[PDB]
Amino acid sequence: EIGRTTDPVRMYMREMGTVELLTREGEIDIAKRIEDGINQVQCSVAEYPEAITYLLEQYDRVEAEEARLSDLITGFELAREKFAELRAQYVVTRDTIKAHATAQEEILKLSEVFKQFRLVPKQFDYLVNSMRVMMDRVRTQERLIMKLCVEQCKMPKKNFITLFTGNETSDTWFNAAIAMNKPWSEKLHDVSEEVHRALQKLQQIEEETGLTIEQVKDINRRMSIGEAKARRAKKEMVEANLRLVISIAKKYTNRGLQFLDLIQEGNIGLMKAVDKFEYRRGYKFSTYATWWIRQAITRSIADQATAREAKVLRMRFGIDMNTDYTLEEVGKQFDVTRERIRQIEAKALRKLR
Amino acid sequence: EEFDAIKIALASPDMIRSWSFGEVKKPETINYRTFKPERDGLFCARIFGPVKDYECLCGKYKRLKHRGVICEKCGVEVTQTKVRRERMGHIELASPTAHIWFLKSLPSRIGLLLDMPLRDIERVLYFESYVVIEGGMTNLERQQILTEEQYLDALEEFGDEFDAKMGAEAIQALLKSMDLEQECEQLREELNETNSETKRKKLTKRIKLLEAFVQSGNKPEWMILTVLPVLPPDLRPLVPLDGGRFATSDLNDLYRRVINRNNRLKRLLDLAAPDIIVRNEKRMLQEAVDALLDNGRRGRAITGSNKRPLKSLADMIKGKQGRFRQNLLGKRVDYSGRSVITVGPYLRLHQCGLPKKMALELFKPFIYGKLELRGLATTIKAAKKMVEREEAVVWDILDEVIREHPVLLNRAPTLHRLGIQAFEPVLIEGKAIQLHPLVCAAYNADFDGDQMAVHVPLTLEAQLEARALMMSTNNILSPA
Amino acid sequence: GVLKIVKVYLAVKRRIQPGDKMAGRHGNKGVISKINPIEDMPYDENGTPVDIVLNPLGVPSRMNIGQILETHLGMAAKGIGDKINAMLKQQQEVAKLREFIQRAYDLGADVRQKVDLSTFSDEEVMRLAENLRKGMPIATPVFDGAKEAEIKELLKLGDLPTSGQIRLYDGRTGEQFERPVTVGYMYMLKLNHLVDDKMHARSTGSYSLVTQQPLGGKAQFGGQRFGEMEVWALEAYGAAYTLQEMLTVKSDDVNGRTKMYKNIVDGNHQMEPGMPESFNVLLKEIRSLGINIELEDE
Amino acid sequence: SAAVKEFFGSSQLSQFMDQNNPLSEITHKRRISALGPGGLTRERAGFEVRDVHPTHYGRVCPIETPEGPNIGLINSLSVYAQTNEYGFLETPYRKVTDGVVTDEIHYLSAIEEGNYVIAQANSNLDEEGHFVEDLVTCRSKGESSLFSRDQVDYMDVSTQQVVSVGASLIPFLEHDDANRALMGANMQRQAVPTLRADKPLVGTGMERAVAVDSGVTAVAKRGGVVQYVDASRIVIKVNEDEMYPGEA
Amino acid sequence: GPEEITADIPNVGEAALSKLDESGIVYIGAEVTGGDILVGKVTPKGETQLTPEEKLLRAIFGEKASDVKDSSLRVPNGVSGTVIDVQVFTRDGVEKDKRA
Amino acid sequence: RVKIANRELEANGKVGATYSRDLLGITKASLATESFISAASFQETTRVLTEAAVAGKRDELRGLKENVIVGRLIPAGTGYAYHQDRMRRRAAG
Amino acid sequence: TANSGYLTRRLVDVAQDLVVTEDDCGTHEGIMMTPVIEGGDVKEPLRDRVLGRVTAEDVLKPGTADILVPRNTLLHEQWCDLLEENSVDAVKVRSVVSCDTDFGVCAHCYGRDLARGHIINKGEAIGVIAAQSIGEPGTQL
Amino acid sequence: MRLESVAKFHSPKSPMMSDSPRATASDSLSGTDVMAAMGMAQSQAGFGMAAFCGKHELSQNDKQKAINYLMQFAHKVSGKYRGVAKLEGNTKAKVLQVLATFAYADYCRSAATPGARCRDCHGTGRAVDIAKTELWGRVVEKECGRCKGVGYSRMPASAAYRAVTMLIPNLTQPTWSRTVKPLYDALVVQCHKEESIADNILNAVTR
RNA sequence: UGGGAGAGGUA
DNA sequence: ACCACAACGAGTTACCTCTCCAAGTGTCAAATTTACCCAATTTTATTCAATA
DNA sequence: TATTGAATAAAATTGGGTAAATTTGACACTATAATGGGTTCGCTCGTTGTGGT
């Protein structure tokens, strides 16, 4: 009963004992819903041509050989010829974007050629983060433009709603909102610099995505409901496996920590387990999860238990001396620097080659 | 150092940031291989000052010629290590937590403010139930507690209009949103129509609390901590034992637990965690802060290794072994010693027999002064060897010094004021004090093993106070 | 963590001195106040001085009369030992020794001990007289004691006064105490509360880490605790300067105590006091409780 | 091993032994503590647990205890006191039959003696027969009143049955006030051993029992004759009767 | 650095070194007083600086911790008496001493 | 304070207040004294510091316990002259 | 002795700040000291009950000689013998409970400093003296 | 030489963090006999001890002692400066007080004065030249160009001038530099002289 | 260095 | 309007003795310091003549 | 015959900024199945707030 207790682990046991336990098939189709959410956000970024031109940007800078393709793409050697084919697909979608159903079906063709565009999972995390940077950057530019485009009005929204169904870019809806003889018109007709700044920002959006705000706004809505369904399925998966964290956290109870701190470290380990969980390997959930639970708990218990640029490579690579030296000892005996010598030797390696 | 008042009030988060010298960010105290503090730890030298007297940590700047200098290899300013008991830190809490004193020290100071039950307040802080803050509809009234079922049906019903929160952030929002002047006017006009005596006394309690708040100038939301100050490290030291193992500092353990749970709450809030895990982590941080402030008050006492409850800051303040009652109203004292008393039946009424070794130890800076004034000792090492070898000239100097210098003689328990009396000492061979047989009724001192303490007064004011007030030939009659 | 351990054992002989605690067996404790010469101790007309002079005014308030009865029985036992020692020093016979020791043995009223030296061979009687030449030991069970009639009977055997009291002479003036004084042989013990362990003194030493007050204990050279009741006693006297001296410059005021030491060595007995460091400890702890306390300047 | 070493090293009843004289160690080894794990606590004990209950006659000493804040809570076992197999204290009595006080010894526990009339040890006997008087003192059902010479059921086995070991070394204890006899029994245990030992001329006869039973002397395991004495060794040739047929 | 128990004690007078033996332990029978030495244990203080003086010292002698802090066991003050028993325990591997 | 307020009220010619004496016990009077340093150093330090921190008080150091804790001369005996000197300084200043 | 120490601590802490701060409050209140005659005997007579006080008003009896001692006089020993030889019944004297001095008492409503015999000075911690004097024989109770 | 060890000794007891402590000998000195030697060396050379303790903010009461000794020295030495030697009594006492206080604050000013540390070097007065490290390989140092090597902003002498022309209004800056400011520089040179002679007498005592 | 427990003791 | 529960706080003072209380290591983006420039701005000894 | 105030030039300081080093903090090490915890009493007496027919 809510009320008569003060033991925090008793309240936590009472809280976790309400969500039911999954069966063998329940985690399977919950992971299927997780797969549906991640391919949902993958197909909303597949149609997005800005991800395509940024991956082409990363392609023609890695064609200058600054990085390796081992930590860039997991597959679909074959990488060079396949990326040449994808560059050909990029340039045919580039020069045939000017014409409109052919442009539509070539957006479909670049989104389905994105279906083999699978990369290594650390770089895939970095790619969904960089897509968050640029894509959510133009998302929050649209968000600041809609908040800034509603806050200056201070009128009833209804005529602005019927005006908002159009383009909301140029000055003809501005003149339509001016020529409708209301007292807010003659005091708000000085909004021309606001809609003109929205005009130049929207021409940046026009060279960015090709067309209007409505398609990218519903694409943002698709990304939002995809990530929301993924978050809700992740919550439904972690809320039916806390008993696993209790069953593992009992074995390390008197090893430097209290009880609930072990449970919370295991909860973070379970979140990292379900974030990296795949279902097609046949193993159900527990033998994959218990590795991350035990590892996070024992790690928390372990926790509670140019002449200069030439000479740094001289004392760095084991050359011109007896034994090798890592990035720590010659850093601390050279200067007080630790990662600066890594930047210095990276500049030396990208300079002399 | 002139002042004429001592003023107490509540502490702003910007006030705690103004006392602060840097945020403690990691729960490590010191490295244990090399006894050096960690960066941004609980013992950090860049925040709390250097360890050695007039050095830095890396030992580059060793001399006093760099009297205040921020070093470059480590960043710890070379100065006195006296600053390690004056410089406080702070901890930016990842969520607001309630202060245990203004929640449990009865009357509860929040249930007296908002007029809420303490059970409902604790049920909100314990993440067991919601409470509405502002209702745009007429269906919901302020300070109404909702269960989670009621919260879900009202959330799907009204959609977005009301806003109910849960935990200490909800109570901080309530205290931020309340209006003390309008509440005081409403209660003052309520007190006219109040005929019930219990409602009258409860209303006078609440009215005086509101009037105290508006006349002191404290905001009422400062009873909910958002920044947590950190005691300086020389006031919670690490004491090594003899076997290379440090001793358990309970304040360091509780501070370390707060930093660990706060870092984990920051990682959960950044990782977009599920709400059950986030609420459990916030509840653990709230109880860890409450344990640090006053351990054995809200729930069970958090114990240490030896199954004793840990000391907290309220334990360091309160009690017979507390700071007040053990170090401010009475303390240990230099120029003092003790021995067994015997009878001197050959003394006058103003004389005590004081042993030679005792008076020689108690009177050593006076002997150094007369050794300089007579010229028998020119260097301090020579004076040290002269007093240590106990030369006959040193005994002559001691007989000159002891002469007309009263000492205070005290026997516990000092039940009344005639258990401290000033006598003029006679230097006798032996190890026992020789009390005069007539003052034994005042001291209640028979000779079956009673011991007494000698206390040397130093200044001329203290010597004349002992001569004119506390001399045993002034205390002839009782005061009782 | 250790390599080798060296343990060293010392051994001291501690003679008694003024201030050493001493007791009998009947709850009569006492502290030695003086060590008097043999020519100053009182004596009887054989010139034997007394070893210990106790106070008679400690008896009739505490009502331990076993003190007095043990004194009288010890006087009787030592008288028997004196007569056996006289016969042994004169080398009388074995028959005289056997007769006298037998007479001293079968002396009580209806006592249960039956010792008979007829079975004792002469070497055993000489050995028994040698062990009895310093006084015949006497048993007396609890609640089964010797009566005053048997004590007086043993005193009459030992050619001593029956009332227990002899006439003592003054050690110094040579005159005589006007009344007869109870003289006998109590059994004194030396308790472990010695003035070598109680005596302590300290001018300046080490200080505690948090509070900056002097340490506590003879083991680590500490200061005597000027507690709350002594603060009240100085407040009742009015000694405001003595109380400020106790609270600041003999205590946790650092600049005040350094300046007081060098001012005393400079011959200028004058203090300049300031804030005790335990008050700053208190201010920092009430501040670390999230409560802004501050010395308001005027 | 961790639990049993924790107990034996640092329990509240595993005390550093007093070793001033042999009486100190033997009184420590015969001590009874009301405190500890499962027992009382020193600060919150009243006057009712710190009093001499009438069932302490022969089991617990009434005049040996500390004189501080520990006064009724630390006691001392009496001289003849035993335990049951259950752990209750019992003390021996001589059964009288038809006035004839025999030499048969019964250890009566604390509740069994509360039924019978038990004579005092200071009652007079003759010819190994009966009492010399009619109105004989006794104690029964707590109180102690006068009884007839045939009604009596038991007698105390000795006159020192009440007092402990250290309280039965005091000569003329019956002429002492109890407040001073308590302190004498306490202060005998703080007496340092001096350079040359010196027997008391006035004693009790319990001294030989304490000195042998303390284990602080060297008693002879098998009798015989002494072959070689030293300052640090005694070599005893055993009699051939006590000698075993396979040894020297 | 590991400590050692040897009679070689720096900056002390040779009067106090009469009571010790050649192995650093006091003789059985020596009447010690307060402020005397019973067993000579020295501690490595620490290099922490590179001056030509200490460089020439470690060149000429080889006492590579030539700054050592004498932390010998001394008898506490006011205590006297003879020495009747000395017991030396050692761990495995370390060769003990002539005195041991 | 009530007598001083009624004194100034009859000085400036007004109504004045009607009071009633309250016999408090020793513990209740020494905790309800008007100085939180003395009340905290006597008893119930948590409750005394909590109420004083909420009310925003200030100790004027008028008493022996406060001048012992802070460390100045007590207003008694030989310190009475210095304390009335400080009073006339900070009053006539 | 545990209860006596706790009572003496509570008494000193209730009466620590009471200092003689004035010289005369100039009031006319006081207590009428009469000899305690409770039971069948006198317990403490008027001489012991009034020796060292200060008269709140003049003595006004026809009596035996119509004695008049003036207001605000410290009753000495010979004044107590004057009260004896004229057999005075009762006398209203001032007390500290009726001193009109705020923040302390006056010297005349306390009277004789009993440790010294003369009248009390100002700047005396009479509350600490009073609390020690009451709590000291608690061990004798 | 000798004096700064005593400034180490004026602190409270600091916690040690090492292995086996407590040398328990008279190797250097104790902590109380150093103060006893400061007391023995106070009858002569008390000026420099008071000035040193006031400069290093240990025993912050002898700042007034050092200002009083400097005022006595200025009263004895004022008969050789043409600007001050013609003034009347209490006015000359007040100008000697104000320039003694400003001269002592100028002597006290080091890199630990609040608001006086250099902006770039943070008091060390020693920055690293990046070009010489790039051409040499090793790490080099140079003089901090903002502070010009001293590590702290020096006290301008015109602060005393502004604080005296609120009392002597008709004293302009050229005559201030001509016949007043040598007395100010004589005061700070006397502070350094007294500190040196007190360190010499301290080393003569504790030898 | 110097902190905390527990045990016993003295007045 | 008028009574039975939890929890706090209190229990003298001082002193003494004892026992017992893993591992860098590579990498990456963003924020932060740091060595330097520089215009303004203040400081301080020096010059010119005009009285002294 | 000096000495002093207005003017002054050179140097020290200061507030602001700024491009470029460089430091900070976080990560990162991966698959049979495994799914709800071990503390506490004989340890008295007064007070006070909180909750209850």
Ligand SMILES: [Mg+2]
């Ligand atoms: Mg006594």
Ligand SMILES: [Zn+2]
């Ligand atoms: Zn450094």
Ligand SMILES: [Zn+2]
């Ligand atoms: Zn009056």
Ligand SMILES: [Zn+2]
């Ligand atoms: Zn600089």
